[PDB]
């Protein structure tokens, strides 16, 4: 008994399922896996209490997920940043404060500052709405992030940090991704400072008890309406009602469909009539990134006694993990260090066993933190999202050179009675649980409008700022704004 069938049981699909349900429509969520959540997964066991193996951090400006979470009963806590962060470079650890690791060489400094600034400068020229309408869309999209970096960075030290920055943001290589798309990505989160910041940015907080809780609690509000172990394999739009068919043979009929699965994963559904050419091809050109999330558990948060907060930014090819955060529960309990094994390394180290990875991570953390204690883990958890069939990767989808301009506007164009959600279709914090909410609700409202229940006026809604997580605005030093680039200085002579 269905007005709308939502494909996809993740935050986006649930967010949508709920909005429709709240508005008095009969919905149904068909979910392939034996669990809701998708790219969020909260493991619960005795050694760990709870742990986010998937999507986890939420921050200021991410108002939608914060709102939906509150209403569903959930609370946040601050990720630990009281003590010092560590930038570990060329085999040595240098402690620091603030978002960016400091650089002492005045030339290198000019270069670094210019890089971050130019990402943001370039970004101001790309609309979130429609990145392909950027004045230099063609040029920028026809060129990789590695190219742009090779051009923009006069120092090896800045090329390397920039690379790490790209690797960490989108779990792909700089040579894999289009410049236009990457620049769009960063800007639709609020620029470099917002995206890279723990305190006052994207990694500020986590949900008490896990984020799996979000889509779980929505499943509760919907009773028997969410159907687990139901992978959709066929959508048929020939008749008056849309027929949607699952791998186990059940048939569902609906006036409308929200597809809230990752773009490329539409490949997994057979369509009748065939999809329009643009979409048929678009969905083969949009891969997801590669990451292993790893958590190592320790008797005590030892790092803090050495005045380290747990954050490590680790340069170099040999290091299996480039970025860590402290994962100790808000109490002091269950101390842990979180880390990502990114991009090409997620492929290299997947060859090893669970134990061999644990060993490599510990030896690293031991070197970086300079403490024997890191060699004594009390427990370990990991997830390699590269092997998930109904995910395709993590965190999100990336666009190779040339594809955003050409196939861009396809992603959220309705196909008859199919409407498209999922975070990759958001316009603010796309890539994140936030985007998942934006997209989920907009797609729902699109259907509402088609049924003539709300005006076009009302499809895209703005969101009131959170009271519990107010957003400090981002500011820049006069010197930051005005210092020359390395070439610019060379030009200030001859």
Ligand X SMILES: CCCCCCCCCCCC[N+](C)(C)[O-]
Residues that bind its own copies (CB under 8 A): 142-144, 146-147, 173, 175-176, 231, 233-234, 247, 249, 264-265, 267-268, 270-271, 274-278, 280-281, 284-288, 290, 344, 347, 350, 384, 386-389, 392-393, 400-403, 406
Size of interface with ligand FAD, in residues (CB under 6 A): 42
Q: What does the alpha-carbon distance between residue 174 and residue 193 come to, in Å, rounded to a whole number? A: 20
Q: Are strands 251-254 and 379-384 parallel, antiparallel or unpaired?
A: unpaired
Each residue 49-88 as x (binds ligand X by CB under 6 A) or -, in order, gives --------x-------------------------------
212 binds, among ligand FAD, its own copies, ligand X, none (CB under 5 to 8 A by kind): none
Each residue 220-239 as x (binds ligand FAD by CB under 6 A) or -, in order, gives -----------xx-------
Residues 325/79, Cβ–Cβ less than 8 Å: yes
336 binds, among ligand FAD, its own copies, ligand X, none (CB under 5 to 8 A by kind): none
CA angle 464, 412, 438 (to 5 degrees): 20
Smallest gap, in angstroms, from Cβ of residue 249 to its own copies? 7
Q: By CB under 6 A, name the one of 51, 65, 196, 436 that touches ligand X.
A: 196
φ and ψ at 5, to 5 degrees? -100, 120
Q: Name the 3-class secondary structure at 280.
A: helix
DSSP 58: B
DSSP string, 354-386: HHHHHHHHHHHHHHHHT-GGGG--SEEEEEEGG
Segment (H or E) for 115: helix 106-123
Q: Is 394 in the site for ligand FAD (CB under 6 A)?
A: yes
Q: What does the alpha-carbon distance between residue 367 and residue 185 come to, in Å, rounded to a whole number? A: 33
Each residue 240-269 as x (binds ligand FAD by CB under 6 A) or -, in order, gives --------------------xxx--x--xx
Kindly tell me which of 20 and 386 has the beta carbon lying closer to ligand X: 386
168 binds, among ligand FAD, ligand X, its own copies, none (CB under 5 to 8 A by kind): ligand X
**By CB under 6 A, what part of segment 32-91 binds ligand FAD?**
32-33, 38-40, 54-57
Encode 116-134 in three state secondary structure: HHHHHHHHCCCCCCCHHHC
Q: Locate tokens 């349900």: which residue?
A: 21
Which two structure tokens, joined as six digits, stand for 159? 């090329």
Each residue 393-412 as x (binds ligand X by CB under 6 A) or -, in order, gives --x-----------------
Q: Is 401 in the site for ligand FAD (CB under 6 A)?
A: no
Q: What does the alpha-carbon distance between residue 29 and residue 79 come to, in Å, rounded to a whole number? A: 33
Residues 209/74, Cβ–Cβ less than 8 Å: yes
Smallest gap, in angstroms, from Cβ of residue 383 to ligand FAD? 7
Segment (H or E) for 9: none
Q: Which residues bind ligand FAD (CB under 6 A)?
A: 7-13, 30-33, 38-40, 54-57, 231-232, 260-262, 265, 268-269, 291, 293, 385, 390-391, 394-396, 422-423, 431-436
């Amino acid at each position: 008994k269905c007005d709308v069938v939502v494909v996809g049981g993740g935050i986006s699909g649930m967010a949508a399922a709920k909005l429709l349900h709240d508005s008095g429509l009969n919905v149904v969520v068909l979910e392939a896996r034996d669990r809701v959540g998708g790219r969020t997964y909260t493991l619960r066991n005795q050694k760990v209490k709870y742990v986010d193996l998937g999507g986890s951090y939420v921050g200021p400006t991410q108002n939608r997920i914060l709102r939906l979470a509150k209403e569903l009963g959930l609370e946040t806590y601050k990720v630990n940043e009281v003590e010092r962060l560590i930038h570990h470079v060329k085999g040595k650890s240098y402690p620091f404060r603030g978002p960016f690791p400091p650089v002492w060489n005045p030339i290198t400094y000019l270069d670094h500052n210019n890089f971050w600034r130019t990402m943001d400068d370039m970004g101001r020229e790309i609309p979130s709405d429609a990145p392909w309408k950027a004045p230099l869309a063609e040029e920028w999209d026809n060129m990789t992030m590695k190219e742009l970096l090779d051009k923009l960075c006069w120092t090896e030290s800045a090329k390397q940090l920039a690379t790490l920055f790209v690797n960490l943001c989108v779990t792909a290589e700089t040579h894999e991704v289009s410049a236009l798309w990457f620049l769009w990505y960063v800007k639709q989160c609020g620029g470099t400072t917002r995206i890279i910041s723990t305190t006052n940015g994207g990694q500020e907080r986590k949900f008490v008890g896990g984020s799996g809780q979000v889509s779980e609690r929505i499943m509760d509000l919907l009773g028997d309406r969410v159907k687990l172990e139901r992978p959709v394999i066929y959508i048929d739009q020939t008749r008056e009602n849309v027929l949607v068919e699952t791998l186990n043979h059940e048939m569902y009929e609906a006036k409308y469909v929200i597809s809230a699965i990752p773009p490329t994963l539409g490949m997994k559904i057979h369509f009748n009539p065939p999809l329009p050419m643009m979409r048929n091809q678009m969905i083969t050109r949009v891969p997801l990134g590669s990451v292993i999330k790893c958590i190592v558990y320790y008797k005590e948060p030892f790092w803090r006694k050495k005045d380290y907060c747990g954050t490590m930014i680790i340069d170099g090819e040999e290091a299996p993990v480039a970025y860590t955060l402290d994962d100790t529960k808000p109490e002091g309990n269950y101390a842990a260090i979180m880390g990502f094994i990114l991009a090409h390394k997620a492929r290299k180290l997947a060859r090893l066993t669970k134990e061999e990875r644990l060993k490599k991570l510990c030896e690293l953390y031991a070197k970086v933190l300079g403490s024997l204690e890191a060699l004594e883990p009390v427990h370990y958890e990991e997830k390699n999202w590269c092997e998930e069939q109904y995910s395709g990767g993590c965190y999100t989808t990336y666009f190779p050179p040339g594809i955003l301009t050409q196939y861009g506007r396809v992603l959220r164009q309705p196909v008859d009675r199919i409407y498209f959600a999922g975070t990759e279709t958001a316009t603010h914090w796309s890539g994140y649980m936030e985007g998942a909410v934006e997209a989920g609700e907009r797609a729902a409202r699109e259907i509402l409008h088609a049924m003539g229940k709300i005006p076009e006026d009302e499809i895209w809604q703005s969101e009131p700022e959170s009271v519990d997580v107010p957003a400090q605005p981002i500011t820049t030093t006069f010197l930051e704004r005005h210092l020359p680039s390395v070439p610019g200085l060379l030009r200030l002579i001859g």
